[PDB]
Amino acid sequence: LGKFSQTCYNSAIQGSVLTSTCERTNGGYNTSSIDLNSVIENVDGSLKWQGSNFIETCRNTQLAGSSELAAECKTRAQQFVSTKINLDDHIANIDGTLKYE
Amino acid sequence: LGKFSQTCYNSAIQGSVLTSTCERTNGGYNTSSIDLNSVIENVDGSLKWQGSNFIETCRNTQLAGSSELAAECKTRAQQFVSTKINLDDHIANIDGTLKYE
Amino acid sequence: LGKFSQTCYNSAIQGSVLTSTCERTNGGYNTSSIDLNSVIENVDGSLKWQGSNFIETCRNTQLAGSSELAAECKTRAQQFVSTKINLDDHIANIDGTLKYE
Amino acid sequence: LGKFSQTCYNSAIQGSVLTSTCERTNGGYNTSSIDLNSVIENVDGSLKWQGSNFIETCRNTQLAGSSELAAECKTRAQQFVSTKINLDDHIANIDGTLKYE
Numbered sequence: 101l102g103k104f105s106q107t108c109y110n111s112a113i114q115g116s117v118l119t120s121t122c123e124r125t126n127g128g129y130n131t132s133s134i135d136l137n138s139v140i141e142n143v144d145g146s147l148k149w150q151g152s153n154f155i156e157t158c159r160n161t162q163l164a165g166s167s168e169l170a171a172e173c174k175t176r177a178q179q180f181v182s183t184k185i186n187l188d189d190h191i192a193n194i195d196g197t198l199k200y201e
Numbered sequence: 202l203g204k205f206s207q208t209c210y211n212s213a214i215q216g217s218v219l220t221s222t223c224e225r226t227n228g229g230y231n232t233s234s235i236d237l238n239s240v241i242e243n244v245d246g247s248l249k250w251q252g253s254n255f256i257e258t259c260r261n262t263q264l265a266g267s268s269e270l271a272a273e274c275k276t277r278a279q280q281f282v283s284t285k286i287n288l289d290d291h292i293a294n295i296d297g298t299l300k301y302e
Numbered sequence: 303l304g305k306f307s308q309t310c311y312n313s314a315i316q317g318s319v320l321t322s323t324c325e326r327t328n329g330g331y332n333t334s335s336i337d338l339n340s341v342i343e344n345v346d347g348s349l350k351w352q353g354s355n356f357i358e359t360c361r362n363t364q365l366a367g368s369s370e371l372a373a374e375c376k377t378r379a380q381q382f383v384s385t386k387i388n389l390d391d392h393i394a395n396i397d398g399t400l401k402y403e
Numbered sequence: 404l405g406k407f408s409q410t411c412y413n414s415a416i417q418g419s420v421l422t423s424t425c426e427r428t429n430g431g432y433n434t435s436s437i438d439l440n441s442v443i444e445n446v447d448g449s450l451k452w453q454g455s456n457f458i459e460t461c462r463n464t465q466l467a468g469s470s471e472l473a474a475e476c477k478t479r480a481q482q483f484v485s486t487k488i489n490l491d492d493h494i495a496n497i498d499g500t501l502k503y504e
Contacts, residue, residue: 101293101294101295101302101357101358101359101360101361102293102294102361103268103289103293103294104268104288104289104292104293104294104299105267105268105288105289107294108294108299111264112264113262113263113264113270115256115262116255116256116262118270118288118292118299120299122294122297122298122299123294123297124296124297124418125296125297125357125418125419125440126296126417126418126419126420126438127417127418128297129297130296130297130298132297132298132299133299134292134299134300134301136255136270136292137254137255137256139291139301140255140270140286141251141252141253141254141255142252142253142254142255142258142259142272142274142275143249143250143252144252144276144277144282145274145275145276145277145280145281145282145284146274146282146284147255147259147270147272147274147284147285147286148244148252148286149244149286149290149291150242150252151242151243151244151245151249151251152242152243153238153242153243154217154237154238154241154242154243154248155216155217155238155303155327155497155498156303156497156498156502156504157243157303157504158243158248158303158385159303159304159305159382161214161215161216161217162214163212163213163214163219164386166206166212167205167206167212167388167389167390168386168387168388168389169214169219169237169241169248169386169387169389170384170385170386171248171384171385171386172382172383172384172385173243173246173247173248173382173383173385174243174246174380174381174382174383175245175246175380175381175382175383176245176246176380177245177380178302178376179376179377179379179448180360180361180374180375180376180377180448181374181375181377181448181449182372182373182374183360183372183373183374183375183445183448183449183450184366184370184371184372184450185370185371185443185449185450185451185452186369186370187369187370187371187405187407187408187421187439188369188405188406188407188408188409189404189405189452190404190405190442190452191369191405191407191421191437191439192404192405192406192407193406193407193409193410193411193423193425193426195427195428195433196425196426196427196428196431196432196433196435197425197433197435198407198411198421198423198425198435198436198437199437200437200442201404201405202391202392202394202403203389203390203391203392203393203394203403204390204394204395205389205390205393205394205395205400206389206390207390207395208395209395209400215328215329216326216327216328216329217327217328218328219389219393219400221395221400223395223398223399223400224395224398225397225398226397226398229398230398231398231399233398233399233400234400235393235400235401235402236328237389237393238327240392240402241387243385246381246382246383246385247383247385247387248385248386248387249387250387250391250392295357295358296357300358302358302359303495303496303497303504304495304496305491305495305496306470306490306491306494306495306496306501307468307469307470307490307491309496310496310501313466313469314466315464315465315466315472317458317464318457318458318464320466320472320490320494320501322501324496324499324500324501325496325499326498326499327498327499330499331499332498332499332500334499334500334501335501336494336501336502336503338457338472338490338494339456339457339458341493341503342457342472342488343453343454343455343456343457344454344455344456344457344460344461344476344477344486345451345452345454345455346454346478346479347476347477347478347479347483347484347486348476348484348486348488349457349461349472349474349476349486349487349488350446350454350488351446351488351492351493352444352454353444353445353446353447353451354444354445355440355444355445356419356439356440356443356444356445356450357418357419357440359445360445360450363416363417363418363419364416365414365415365416365421368408368414369407369408369414371416371421371439371443371450373450375445375448375449375450376445376448377447377448378447378448379447
């Protein structure tokens with residue numbers, strides 16, 4: 101996983117389609133495309149990240165007061181935690197060669 | 202715009218559907234329903250009004266700087282607003298391939 | 303959005319495949335199936351929810367000390383937030399019939 | 404199991420790939436690489452050792468009560484143990500269709 105702006109170059113937009121040449125995990129580069137048309141929208145003059153259908157991501161829909169739709173809706177925040185795993189658990193030296201066991 | 206509640210009564214929400222009994226222009230009442238599923242969305246845990254396809258309603262879509270997408274988008278009131286979105290928010294490089302995350 | 307156990311019935315599992323008859327959002331029922339094999343795994347004799355590929359969901363992979371793989375990995379916990387939207391914004395009474403404007 | 408770090412040196416991780424220089428059984432050293440992407444996963448923000456396919460390594464899969472998948476799964480000691488998982492955790496009813504969320 102890498103940040104678009106930091107690990108890709110020669111980016112281009114044609115219509116709603118984004119193309120860029122990005123670093124591969126284990127070296128070298130790949131050029132690929134993504135259609136932004138379904139993930140970005142125009143809300144009141146502003147580009148924003150398209151949300152989700154409320155029937156998929158909100159529960160307990162109800163009327164509130166005389167005119168409000170109320171619900172409990174899932175967030176989509178991106179949280180990272182620092183983590184480690186000891187490769188000595190399963191990674192061995194078999195006659196000079198790393199192997200999983 | 203809107204304001205149905207001013208001339209309706211017995212509104213209810215079931216599922217994604219609003220039902221209400223509303224005054225006819227010349228008098229008397231009519232009960233009707235509307236499915237709110239295509240006009241309201243969940244954006245980051247909040248119910249918001251669904252926006253428009255940005256290719257259809259924005260012009261001059263272009264990459265700007267290292268990671269930004271810029272466009273001039275139409276408001277609901279027929280005006281243009283110059284807007285930027287940071288593609289780094291949700292466009293990731295996964296092993297050399299652009300993927301939304 | 304409904305909880306499987308609360309809004310479905312006549313559920314069965316055959317092999318890795320879950321079948322059930324579930325409430326539709328706006329009334330009635332539907333029977334569908336889901337293959338649990340790609341989302342559940344056996345970890346040391348316990349069924350657990352399968353995780354994600356660490357290259358898709360973790361960044362900054364590095365070796366820590368002599369034998370540890372270290373990274374910053376995304377969580378998959380999202381809260382539910384109580385939200386409301388005023389349907390009077392865009393829902394109107396047009397001669398006895400609810401319409402979006 | 405494992406313990407590569409005891410007889411190896413100049414270890415490094417790049418992307419998902421561990422590289423190390425390891426002692427050969429009959430003396431001398433060899434540098435090799437192992438891709439960790441298929442044996443480690445991100446589970447809830449923690450790096451963990453990947454488990455096995457439950458259909459291949461468990462037996463007697465069935466639904467228990469209204470929401471639980473029950474099985475007997477093989478342990479690293481090669482015996483079967485009783486295990487359950489609450490399908491409510493991630494199996495949702497979306498408008499009548501079972502969907503992982």
